[PDB]
Structure formats: C-alpha cells, structure tokens
C-alpha cells in the first residue's frame, strides 16, 4: 500500500483608509462714526 494525501489553504485580507478634512473660517464686523466720534471692529478666525 501507498496513501498519500495533502491540503494546502492560504486566505488573505488587506483594508486601506485615506481620510483627509480641512475646513477655515473668518468673520469680521465693523462699525465707524465720525464727527461724537468712534471705530469699532471685530475680526474672527477658526
């Protein structure tokens, strides 16, 4: 007699992420008065 018997399994499994966010923000406001007299400003950033 002879038996002969053989199993090979291979399993392979690859993920990838990329994840790329940027956002920027400004907002300004201004109110001026000359003559009573007066400048006022706001300026802001996010």
Partial sequence: EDDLK???YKD???L???EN???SF???GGSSFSVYSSK????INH
Avoid: M
């Fill in 40 to 43: 006022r400003s706001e300026n």
């Fill in 6 to 8: 053989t199993d090979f």
């Fill in 21 to 23: 966010q940027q956002g």
């Fill in 16 to 18: 990838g992420h990329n």
């Fill in 12 to 14: 392979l499994t690859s």
């Fill in 26 to 28: 400004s907002s300004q």
